[PDB]
Each structure stands twice: as C-alpha cells, then as structure tokens.
Design an enzyme around this catalytic site. Structure first.
Site, mmCIF file in Angstrom:
data_model
loop_
_atom_site.group_PDB
_atom_site.id
_atom_site.type_symbol
_atom_site.label_atom_id
_atom_site.label_comp_id
_atom_site.label_asym_id
_atom_site.label_seq_id
_atom_site.Cartn_x
_atom_site.Cartn_y
_atom_site.Cartn_z
ATOM 1 N N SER A 15 0.836 -1.214 0.000
ATOM 2 C CA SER A 15 0.000 0.000 0.000
ATOM 3 C C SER A 15 0.871 1.265 0.000
ATOM 4 C CB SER A 15 -0.951 0.010 1.225
ATOM 5 N N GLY A 55 -0.710 3.715 -17.951
ATOM 6 C CA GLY A 55 -0.718 2.667 -18.969
ATOM 7 C C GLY A 55 -0.162 1.328 -18.480
ATOM 8 N N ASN A 91 6.967 -8.571 1.494
ATOM 9 C CA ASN A 91 7.365 -7.307 2.054
ATOM 10 C C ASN A 91 6.626 -6.989 3.363
ATOM 11 O OD1 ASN A 91 8.590 -4.455 1.739
ATOM 12 N ND2 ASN A 91 6.394 -4.080 1.722
ATOM 13 N N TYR A 156 12.718 -7.551 15.928
ATOM 14 C CA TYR A 156 12.884 -7.259 14.463
ATOM 15 C C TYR A 156 14.047 -8.018 13.862
ATOM 16 C CZ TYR A 156 12.085 -4.441 10.117
ATOM 17 O OH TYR A 156 11.825 -4.004 8.820
ATOM 18 N N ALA A 158 15.584 -10.729 15.003
ATOM 19 C CA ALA A 158 15.208 -12.159 14.990
ATOM 20 C C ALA A 158 14.378 -12.522 13.736
ATOM 21 C CB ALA A 158 14.440 -12.517 16.243
ATOM 22 N N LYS A 160 14.037 -10.837 10.887
ATOM 23 C CA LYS A 160 14.770 -10.643 9.634
ATOM 24 C C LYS A 160 15.942 -11.576 9.455
ATOM 25 C CE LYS A 160 11.806 -7.625 8.392
ATOM 26 N NZ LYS A 160 11.224 -7.546 7.044
ATOM 27 N N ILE A 189 16.132 4.010 4.883
ATOM 28 C CA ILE A 189 15.435 4.444 3.694
ATOM 29 C C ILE A 189 14.514 5.578 4.058
ATOM 30 C CG2 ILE A 189 13.934 3.709 1.816
ATOM 31 C CD1 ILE A 189 16.668 2.240 1.905
#
Ligand code: NA
Lengths: 236, 225, 229, 237
Positions: A15, A55, A91, A156, A158, A160, A189
């Site tokens: 999303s 398109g 993701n 987190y 663990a 990943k 990011i």
C-alpha cells in the site's frame, strides 16, 4: 526495462513506503502487479489508479499475510484471474521496538508472526504455485537489522535474520524447478544518522525497489540463496 | 579456564550437548543448574554423577518456551545462589520436512521451542545480570529445514541485538553453531564432532578468556561451513 | 536496456570469456565499451568489429593491467578520446591451482600480481578519474582445495573493494564485487540449479551493479554461482 | 587450557599483540619461539622475563616475508625440539594512505609483509606438522580485513586475503588433523573517539586477543577449523 519471462507479481504490504515503490517499479517494466493491503482500500485503490493512468497493469487484493488461510485464498484468486503467478515479493512487515528487558513474549510473537511466519507462508505458496510451470522468482524484503542486530530490536532482528536464513533453505527446495529465492536488506530508507552512511544520504524506496526487480528479473537467473544489501555502504 | 562468575543455567541440559556443557562447566568449578523439561530421572542422574565427583550441581524443571516458567526458575536460582552469572540457551527441537509438506504448526513448533525460548532466556539474563554489571550468555544452535534454519538464523541475529543491549553493563552475548555432532564425507576433518568439542567452545565463550568477544558466532563444524 | 547515466566503460581482460560477454552486454545497452587486451590484437579487433557492425560503440586498447604505468597511460587515452570515464570493470584474472605444499612463492605472487594488484591499480585510477565528475561505478570480478593463492587474491579483492567503497562514497563512486561460480556433470552435482552458468549471466549482474538501478549499493559482493555458496 | 602440543612459533612476537601471545602461551606450558626481525634487545628482554618466571622460551631472528629465512628458522626449531606443534602468523605492518596517493610499492609492501608472510608460514606448518598428523595454526588478521577501511585499501586487501587463504589451508590440513583459523582484532590498546562505536565502550587489551589465539590453538577447539574469530568488542557483528 529489465527482462521478465514472467507476467505478474504479488507484493505483500504494497500500500505504501517500499512496497508501493516495488509495485510502481515492477508495473513500469510491464508486469501486472497485485497490490496486497490489509485495512485501507482507498490508498491501495489510489495506487492502482495511479498506475493504470500511466498505462500499466495493476490490481488490488485484500488479505492479512500473517493469516495462512487468507494467503492461500488470495493466490487462488490470482491463479483464477491470470492463469498463474510467476513472481512474489514478501514485504509485509511491522516493528515494535522495546528494550529486551521490557519486552513481552506477545511483543516478540507479534513481530515474528507478522514478519517471519508471513514470509514462510508466502514462500510456501510460491513453491506450490510456481512448481507446476517450472519457473519463478521470490524476493524476501528484510533489513540491515537482520544482518547486524540493533539496540531495542531483538524481535525485528530475529524476524529478519530468520527470514534471510529461511530464504536460503527455500532456494535449495526450489532450485531443481528453477524457482529462485533471494533476499534484500535495506538500510536507512527515506520514509542525523546519515553520518554513518558512506554515501552520506538516506536511500529512496526506489533504490530498494530496483534491486528487488533485478532479483526477480531474468538478469539474475544464476542467482539464488543470496542476500543483496541496499544500505549505502552502512554495512559491508 | 578462568571464570569470574560462580554459577550457570543451562537449558535442555539433560542429555546430548546440554549434558556435556553441564559436565564441562561443573569440572571447571561452576555450580551448574540443569534444566529439564520432561525426564526427571536422566537429569537427576546427571546431578548425582557430578556431585559424586565433588562438583556443585542442581536440577530445575521448566519449559524454556514458557515465559512464566522461565521467570519462576530464575527467581529460584537467585534465591539459592544470590544471583546468576552465566546462561546457556540450548533448548532445541527439530522437525524436518519439505516445505510443501510442512504445516504452520510445524513451523511454530520449532520457532517457539528454539527461538522464542532463547529470547526469553536472553531477556531474563539481562534483567538478572545487569544489577551486578557482569555476565555471559551463549546461544547454541541445533533441504527440508526451512523451520530450523529460520529459528537458528533468527537466534544468531537476535543474539547480536542482545549483545548491543548488554554491552554497557559488560553482559556478553554470543552464539555457537555446531555441525554434525555424534548421537562424514563432506566434513574436512572427516569425522563427527563430540558433544565435548561443542561444550568446550561454549565454555570459552562464557570464560573470562573471551572478554572482548560479543555479538559473535563461533562455528564448531569441522570445516563443513 | 538498464539505465546508465554514464557513457563509457573500460573492461580489463575483455578479449574473451566473461570479459568479452561483459563488453557485448554493455555495448548492447548503449555504452561505449573499451576492450582491453594484453597480447592478441586480432581477437580483440574481431570483437570490436562485431559490435560496430551491430551499430554499437566500441574501441580496443592494449595494456597490461598488472602494470601501473600501462594502466595510467590507457586511462589518459580514454579521457582524451571520450572526455572522461564513467565505468570500470576489473576482470583481468588468472588461476594457478596447486596444493599449498607444492606451491612456490612465485606461484603465489603470480596470481596476486595478476588478480589483486591489477584490481588495485584499476580501482585507484577509477577514483582519480571519476572524482572530478562526482560520478562512477566500478565492478571487481572475483576457500578451496588447491587454491590458497586464488582464494587469497579473491578474498583480498573483495576486502579491498569495500575499502574503495568507503573512499569513493562521498563522491558517488560505487565499488562492488561479483563472485562467479562454475561458468561454461560431476561439477554440476553440487550446484542447486544443477547447471553451469553462462558468461551472459555473469555479464548481466555486472551490468546491474554498474547501472543506475543499483545506486544505493556499494561495498557489496554479488554471488553469481547458482546456489553453490 | 589443554595443549597436546609442546611448542609454538610466533612471528612478530617482540611487542604488542605478538608479545602477549608469547606470554600467554608460555604461562600455559608451551615453549615459545619469539621471532623478531630487527631489535634483538627487546626480544631478549621478553625471553629473559619469561625464563625468570620458569617458562620455556627462545628467540629467533628472521624475516617472515623471506621464504628462505622462514624455512631455515623452522629447520632450527625442529632440530632443537624434535618438531613444531603450533604456529602463529602475526607478522604485520601498516602503511595507510588514501588510494589516490598510494603507490604500487606501498601496496606490495603490505601484501608481502602481511599476506605472503602468512602464506609461507602456513605452507611450512603444513610440511612440518603433517608427518605427526597434528597441529594448529592461527593467522592474526583484523576487523579491517572483514569490513574494509578509509585509507586502508592495502591493509584490508592483505587481511581479507589472509582470512580467505586460511580457509583454503584448513581444507588442505584437515585429513591430517592440522587446523587453520583466524582472529580479527578490533581496536586494541596501541602503546575516546575510537571507543564510542564499540559496544563494550573500551579498547581491548593485547591479552584479550592473546587468549583467543590460545583457545584456537588449544585442544579445546579441536572441532574448529576454517573459522574466523572476531575479537572486537561488538564493533563488527
Ligand atoms: Na579476559
């Protein structure tokens, strides 16, 4: 545009943020993108609209990637519309940072179920659905935290770390049937701490999105079981 | 080997690798706490064996996967010994199957028993060792192993995060990744390892000898990886 | 065609095998390729000709990548013809497998000079020449029974490349590595994909790491080995 | 710690980390051979110190970068002691420069002194330890070799190379129970801007490195080969 033998792609948690860019990027290279959302239909529809207006081919699909039965249904829906599924991007991810001494088991499971179990289900389904046609590629989107650890992120890291390890195991299991599995580990990011990044800036969602695309593309056809760091030199 | 600390809790210490860790550490002067989940007889026989050699040892029932059990057990140790200096997360199960045959229940089963358990143990170590600004903690690891590799990859990553969080207070976290251990062609040393060889690497990582080592993974696999 | 902000590329040891495919691949995506050769002009010219006949831009250039002074001269030549150099691929590489107990120091240096020192020189020059324009990307093409010298030179290259990545980072000069496995059936048995890779498959991973697509990627090693490691 | 072997050669053992390796290993009952290149007095003072404590120690002059010097020196040890059970490749120099300022000579200088030297040592260890089907060898490298560094293209190269090379040696010594491993120290006390990035929030002692080397040599690590042991205080994980 990179070369894709496959025709369509499912992206979980598509999303916003990184998931949304993966959808944009892959759509712009001619793949039909399936935009998974959990709650808000309007944001996901606005993304689908945006892509169609340029398109490209796109669809939206509601489910919770942590739910086994929701993920199986959603794949059945895609196979029914498109005839199969060539590409998948796991993701879906949440955070719940706490110092370990304050962290409860429920806080740990919450991230494990939402990040790791979800990727296991997605990867399992990919293998079921892609074996028939003896072709596929799957990318697990993980994090630098999964490679190097972090203060306040025992859960987190663990989830990943687990994802990275698990993805290699899948790579072994899909290999004979030309179903590749690879991971991406973004650093910081966009959407202070820039000083520790050699490139001395935050990465865009786009820069991550284009590495995912490479790993799905035919260009990476002898690559499987690899982790690709997209962190500006923060970790080498 | 030299230990500033005085005692150690070892999860899944009844048999195999956990048992050898207990023997090794007991012979180097540490009071060992032998966690068992199910079989009392094997655990008590181990405790007895070690006592008969003049070492200090105790037994303790709890399920390392259960948060409330792990907390109670530590309370019991702190009460007997005044604190806890060392911990070894060894509790671990396998349930190998090809991913297409594997159910979510099979995946959770290994995650809860291997990864969640190590999380709880590590968390309690941190609570109980911070006061005294000293500790060391070792996380022992264990085609067809998506759940095992997930739980061990997770453990290795998680341990590093713990190492960050214990660092200021001189609480070290490290991992060990055994290969094929006795219960060969691809192993350069061309033999299986003993439980003893794993047990002595754990001991090093707990010992004062490794005091500048934290957040590391020590492979004990005969060159296999 | 992947996106390139840069215009040209130097590839060492580009006459044949992997180096030749990197040249073809990059030429077909619109870059002017510079084809380094050491000895045989004819093979290198035939490649250049082949690429020109397809409408691509290509040149040949003689030098020994292991020689400091040769490499400097060649870059000067490129800057002079093209105005600068945006991309570089260190591919010059030899093997000389033997068991360590039989291996001489000369055998060890031979591989080190030809594989590692050469990459150092190329990487150093890339940094000199690309810093002015604050843009560039560089790919280094990189244990084992009988390969103490190869693994040393490749382990070194990989480590060295990361050091370069630190040094080029502020000026948006990226450094990365590629580690091919077995490239074109008892060898194949240990490869999960159960086949040898093509030179193309390696060539296209190099291209990615040079392309704008990988712009937040530096200091990384990309394995192109079919799951072998 | 338990040692089946009886003696050890340590290259660049005069001072810093090499010296501590010698002290540590001497105190655990191994006869230590203290290689030095140039300064006899410092090496002799170390040997003296260790002998006065009742330990076994000798000094031996050679340049570890010279093939012929290294062979001779091993021959000397075999001749005095009957064999050589343990070896520590520690000889190492630095010559940091930014790559654009660095000359090839600067690059080779570090490669020959750090990497070639370890290759020779490891080769000889294999020759001399195979007969008796027993040995352990430790290559002392650096965090720089694992993560690289600004101004250390030559150091990283030589340490990255060492770490990779050592694994190849591990393969070749495995059947004969000759183990090869590496250590990668971080910032070690050098005679608080370094310290802030170290989770343990302090520099390591030469001792803490020395005791990890000892472990890897000891019988305690007998199922460990081809491994790299980080001794960096959490600086790199
Ligand atoms: Na110590």
């Amino acid at each position: 545009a990179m070369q894709f033998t496959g025709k369509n792609v499912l992206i979980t948690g598509a999303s916003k943020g990184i998931g949304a860019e993966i959808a944009k990027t892959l759509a712009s290279m001619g793949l039909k993108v399936w935009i998974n959302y959990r709650s808000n239909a309007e944001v996901a529809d606005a993304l689908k609209n945006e892509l169609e207006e340029k398109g490209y081919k796109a669809a939206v699909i509601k489910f919770d990637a942590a739910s086994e039965s929701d993920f199986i249904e959603a794949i059945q829906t895609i196979v029914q519309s498109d005839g199969g599924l060539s590409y998948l991007v796991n993701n879906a991810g949440v955070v719940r940072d706490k110092l370990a001494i304050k962290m409860k088991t429920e806080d740990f499971h919450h991230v494990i179920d939402n990040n790791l179990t979800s990727a296991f289900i997605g990867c399992r389904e990919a293998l079921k659905v892609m074996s028939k046609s003896r072709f596929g590629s799957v990318v697990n989107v993980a994090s630098i935290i999964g490679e190097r650890g972090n203060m306040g992120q025992t859960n987190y890291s663990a989830s990943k770390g687990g994802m990275i390890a698990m993805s290699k195991s899948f790579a072994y299991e899909g290999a004979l049937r030309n179903i590749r599995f690879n991971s991406v580990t973004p650093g910081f990011i966009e959407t202070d701490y820039v000083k520790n990044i050699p490139l001395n800036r935050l990465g865009s969602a786009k820069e991550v999105a284009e590495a995912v695309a490479f790993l799905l593309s035919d260009h990476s056809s002898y690559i499987t079981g690899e982790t690709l760091k997209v962190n500006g030199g923060l970790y080498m």
